Amino acid sequence: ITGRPEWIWLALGTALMGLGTLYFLVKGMGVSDPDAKKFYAITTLVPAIAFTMYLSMLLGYGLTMVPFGGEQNPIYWARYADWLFTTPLLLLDLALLVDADQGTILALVGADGIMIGTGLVGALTKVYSYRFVWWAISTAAMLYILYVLFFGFTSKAESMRPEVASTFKVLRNVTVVLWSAYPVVWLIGSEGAGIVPLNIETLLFMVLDVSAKVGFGLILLRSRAIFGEAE
Amino acid sequence: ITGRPEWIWLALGTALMGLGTLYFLVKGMGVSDPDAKKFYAITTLVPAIAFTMYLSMLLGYGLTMVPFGGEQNPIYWARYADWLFTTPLLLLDLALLVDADQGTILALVGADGIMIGTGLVGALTKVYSYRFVWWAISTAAMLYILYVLFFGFTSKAESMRPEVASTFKVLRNVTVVLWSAYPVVWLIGSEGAGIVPLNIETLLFMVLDVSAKVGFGLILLRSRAIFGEAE
Amino acid sequence: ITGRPEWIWLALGTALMGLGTLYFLVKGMGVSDPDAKKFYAITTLVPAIAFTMYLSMLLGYGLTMVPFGGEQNPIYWARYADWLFTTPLLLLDLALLVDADQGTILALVGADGIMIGTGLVGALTKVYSYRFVWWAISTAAMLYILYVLFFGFTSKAESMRPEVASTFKVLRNVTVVLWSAYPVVWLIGSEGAGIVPLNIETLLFMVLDVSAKVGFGLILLRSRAIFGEAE
Numbered sequence A, B, C: 001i002t003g004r005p006e007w008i009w010l011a012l013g014t015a016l017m018g019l020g021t022l023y024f025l026v027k028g029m030g031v032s033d034p035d036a037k038k039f040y041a042i043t044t045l046v047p048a049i050a051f052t053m054y055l056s057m058l059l060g061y062g063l064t065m066v067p068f069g070g071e072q073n074p075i076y077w078a079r080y081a082d083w084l085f086t087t088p089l090l091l092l093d094l095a096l097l098v099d100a101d102q103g104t105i106l107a108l109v110g111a112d113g114i115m116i117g118t119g120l121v122g123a124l125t126k127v128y129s130y131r132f133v134w135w136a137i138s139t140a141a142m143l144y145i146l147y148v149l150f151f152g153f154t155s156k157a158e159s160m161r162p163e164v165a166s167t168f169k170v171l172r173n174v175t176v177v178l179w180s181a182y183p184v185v186w187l188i189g190s191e192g193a194g195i196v197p198l199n200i201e202t203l204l205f206m207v208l209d210v211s212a213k214v215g216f217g218l219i220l221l222r223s224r225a226i227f228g229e230a231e
């Protein structure tokens, strides 16, 4: 395990996701409100899935070698397995907060699936120049998602409770900033142009992942917006 | 890319799915009705997914070699990845049109999953005679789906709005004819008996795919059946 | 096929799932009640999926070799493909019976996904001692599911119809006993410590699978709890 310099960040990531999972699990024990239960379920599952995939990367299972540029390049494929399930759960948290219509939710989840799926294909593609074609398609799917979060959701939040409108606005802003960093790190890291070494890349993704999951969850689950308006 | 004679049909397929995706995306921009949004979301996602998988076939990612009959046989596995997601979306379009009950929808999607999954296993099976066992099981799942579309849905459409009944009937008929061709092409093509060469097989699937997705979508999204009855 | 001593149990399993599938399919033909249709759909799909995966194991497709302990160890990976889809369907049968809230259903299905997914990783892991780390995480996800079935569902059933409360209690008890055997068989069988040989392991899983699917389904589909209260 320690044979890879990036192991320290995989281990820290595993620990922080594990701790985040346990914290949300305990916190949600005292919850009976049916609406709050939905948000706790979604939000606890996110770091639990990430915990398993960080562990698989730490132990070496979630790593494969991909030939491109005349080299055997270490590619952590387990990231995409994580993201396939956790990024639509994160979007679902946002969509339920603002009572999004079903068509909009399906558009978001579908675009998200395309985003992660094409990122996976790009990560595993052996023809170097083609990796960036997949990156571009994935990034276009991301831009669609960000567009919807701003010009379909923000003006939906404003007709809702003030506490859900303010909580949505904060989580929207956190999401757009954090999620936009992922394609940049991929592009300059070992999957793309290879300018930033894998150990630093792994650190960067770990900070983004913990912030986008445990950070996000801490903000959401401390808000009164997750509860039905009750006396 | 041009090293494979079937590349021209993969390229045309990619282009037509891409163009179809953009057309539906633009067309649905001016839509606020919650019901119509569902149909636009579902129907736009279908060629978008197909676009990505056609591209993966064009670039060579979605192709593998399978030993059977003492030969290395080129198998485009990306078709099944496409179909796994797009065929239940197509069925969902039909089921929502007639306000199908939840049990019926689950039966359809489940049978569809079995249909595509067993087709994939058959496509990748190395014992030649066993490929046709999987083809038979998949075809039985197809026949179940077609049965339900006729003797569970058609008489559901007739108690609904005339515009939804007439639109459903047309899309049902398009679906049954087009979908029934797929097992025949598989059986006589490079996956099955090998009587029709891969380049012609690829052409045939491209015509079926564009018709079943973009053709289907053009009929559906031009109907007033996708809108709630409103003043 | 007969080259593997466990083939007889794979063949019997295939037959019993096939027969169970046909029986439930015929039985549900005379059903119009929308609630009952849901239970028939879910419950018929379960042995149908299991039939396909038992067949893939019989024909040899669903088997791979995994190096650990200095040996090539036969691992039937198709079990996890089965279980990935059938165990959440089984939980859905239980959850719908007691009209579980959406948050609880998502927690169950999510924990179940983690349970099966980590079992799959453990089954395919090449470092022997690490296989048991994945077994432990999977078992913890199982224990969560069993906890919810007892201390979240049982007291939900009691405020419902007596026929649904009594049917739920029986199916809950069947589920907890049968499902708890699976991690034990894995641990002592060819995936784990290797004390029980593969042919006996295969027998054990076949008895558990038929009981947990066809047995379970026979109890559920003969109950009046699956019908809406109607005059």
Ligand SMILES: CC(C)CCC[C@@H](C)CCC[C@@H](C)CCC[C@@H](C)CCOC[C@@H](CO)OCC[C@H](C)CCC[C@H](C)CCC[C@H](C)CCCC(C)C
Residues within 6 Å of the ligand: A084, A109, A110, A113, A114, A117, A118, A120, A121, A124, B049, B052, B063, B064, B077, B080, B081, B082, B084, B085, B120
């Ligand atoms: C509604 C939304 C969910 C829409 C989803 C959007 C989605 C369509 C976007 C594209 C997804 C698609 C790229 C998934 C591809 C998975 C694939 C990378 C798995 C690895 O297999 C690739 C090659 C080795 O590189 O296998 C070597 C050759 C092997 C023989 C491969 C044969 C097995 C195939 C992988 C079977 C395909 C199954 C499905 C792709 C399962 C989807 C997995 C998940 C990653 C989407």
Ligand SMILES: CC(C)CCC[C@@H](C)CCC[C@@H](C)CCC[C@@H](C)CCOC[C@@H](CO)OCC[C@H](C)CCC[C@H](C)CCC[C@H](C)CCCC(C)C
Residues within 6 Å of the ligand: B084, B109, B110, B113, B114, B117, B118, B120, B121, B124, C049, C052, C063, C064, C077, C080, C081, C082, C084, C085, C120
């Ligand atoms: C409700 C509905 C959805 C019901 C669904 C119906 C469904 C049950 C029908 C059968 C689906 C099942 C056949 C999927 C099999 C996928 C498999 C072909 C992927 C390729 O792996 C096959 C061999 C190489 O040929 O791998 C070589 C050996 C490797 C070590 C394989 C180990 C990895 C396994 C593939 C893990 C299994 C994961 C699940 C099958 C994911 C499902 C993928 C999708 C195609 C259904």
Ligand SMILES: CC(C)CCC[C@@H](C)CCC[C@@H](C)CCC[C@@H](C)CCOC[C@@H](CO)OCC[C@H](C)CCC[C@H](C)CCC[C@H](C)CCCC(C)C
Residues within 6 Å of the ligand: A049, A052, A063, A064, A077, A080, A081, A082, A084, A085, A120, C084, C109, C110, C113, C114, C117, C118, C120, C121, C124
């Ligand atoms: C809401 C709930 C559903 C939550 C779900 C919980 C879930 C997160 C729990 C963990 C699931 C995760 C372990 C699935 C891993 C599948 C993996 C074993 C498939 C086989 O690939 C493993 C190695 C060979 O051993 O591939 C060799 C290297 C290859 C290059 C691998 C590259 C292809 C990757 C497999 C692509 C990943 C796609 C997704 C994992 C699809 C999920 C399949 C299913 C088994 C969950």
Ligand SMILES: *C/C=C(C)/C=C/C=C(C)/C=C/C1=C(C)CCCC1(C)C
Residues within 6 Å of the ligand: A083, A086, A087, A090, A115, A116, A119, A120, A135, A136, A138, A139, A142, A179, A180, A182, A183, A186, A209, A212, A213
């Ligand atoms: C918890 C993990 C999260 C929130 C991950 C988010 C990841 C993305 C938004 C990834 C986006 C990518 C692209 C837009 C193109 C390049 C490849 C990706 C997959 C890194």
Ligand SMILES: *C/C=C(C)/C=C/C=C(C)/C=C/C1=C(C)CCCC1(C)C
Residues within 6 Å of the ligand: B083, B086, B087, B090, B115, B116, B119, B120, B135, B136, B138, B139, B142, B179, B180, B182, B183, B186, B209, B212, B213
């Ligand atoms: C957009 C793509 C569509 C509508 C594809 C439909 C495909 C089928 C109905 C495929 C059916 C098959 C069988 C019935 C058995 C042989 C294998 C298949 C998968 C080709």
Ligand SMILES: *C/C=C(C)/C=C/C=C(C)/C=C/C1=C(C)CCCC1(C)C
Residues within 6 Å of the ligand: C083, C086, C087, C090, C115, C116, C119, C120, C135, C136, C138, C139, C142, C179, C180, C182, C183, C186, C209, C212, C213
């Ligand atoms: C129809 C099949 C059923 C009901 C299978 C149930 C399987 C399980 C509950 C498996 C549990 C496992 C663990 C808890 C850890 C070890 C690995 C598994 C996957 C066997």
Ligand SMILES: CCCCCCCCCCCCCCC
Residues within 6 Å of the ligand: A181, A184, A185, A195, A196, A197, A200
């Ligand atoms: C969105 C953030 C992307 C920028 C990442 C900056 C990383 C700077 C680290 C120094 C680069 C290491 C190069 C020498 C090894």
Ligand SMILES: CCCCCCCCCCCCCCC
Residues within 6 Å of the ligand: B181, B184, B185, B195, B196, B197, B200
């Ligand atoms: C459902 C349509 C299946 C029939 C396809 C007919 C294809 C005819 C093309 C000629 C066959 C090529 C054989 C000589 C290369």
Ligand SMILES: CCCCCCCCCCCCCCC
Residues within 6 Å of the ligand: C181, C184, C185, C195, C196, C197, C200
């Ligand atoms: C939950 C049941 C697990 C116990 C399984 C008992 C199997 C006993 C069979 C005898 C073991 C075979 C060892 C000699 C080959």
Ligand SMILES: CCCCCCCCCCCCCC
Residues within 6 Å of the ligand: A084, A085, A088, A089, A092, A102, A105, A106, A109, A113
């Ligand atoms: C490819 C995996 C996509 C599914 C991820 C799980 C999250 C799905 C959330 C469903 C949202 C509800 C839509 C109506």
Ligand SMILES: CCCCCCCCCCCCCC
Residues within 6 Å of the ligand: B084, B085, B088, B089, B092, B102, B105, B106, B109, B113
């Ligand atoms: C194996 C992939 C199956 C899922 C495909 C996505 C479409 C699912 C549509 C869900 C229909 C709603 C059922 C209640």
Ligand SMILES: CCCCCCCCCCCCCC
Residues within 6 Å of the ligand: C084, C085, C088, C089, C092, C102, C105, C106, C109, C113
């Ligand atoms: C990884 C596969 C998980 C999906 C299995 C299919 C069963 C899903 C049942 C959905 C229950 C409804 C939740 C709201």
Ligand SMILES: CCCCCCCCCCCCC
Residues within 6 Å of the ligand: A139, A143, A146, A147, A150, A180, A183, A184
């Ligand atoms: C186009 C929608 C406006 C809100 C999205 C902001 C786009 C940020 C760009 C992210 C950088 C990705 C490379």
Ligand SMILES: CCCCCCCCCCCCC
Residues within 6 Å of the ligand: B139, B143, B146, B147, B150, B180, B183, B184
């Ligand atoms: C049995 C249901 C009647 C409607 C379905 C028509 C079946 C068409 C056969 C398709 C050919 C597949 C090989």
Ligand SMILES: CCCCCCCCCCCCC
Residues within 6 Å of the ligand: C139, C143, C146, C147, C150, C180, C183, C184
């Ligand atoms: C902790 C919840 C109480 C009900 C679950 C009973 C646990 C049975 C243990 C199963 C054995 C697995 C190794």
Ligand SMILES: CCCCCCCCCCC
Residues within 6 Å of the ligand: A128, A129, A132, A133, A136
């Ligand atoms: C070796 C790099 C070749 C450049 C490929 C860039 C493709 C980016 C596509 C953006 C439309």
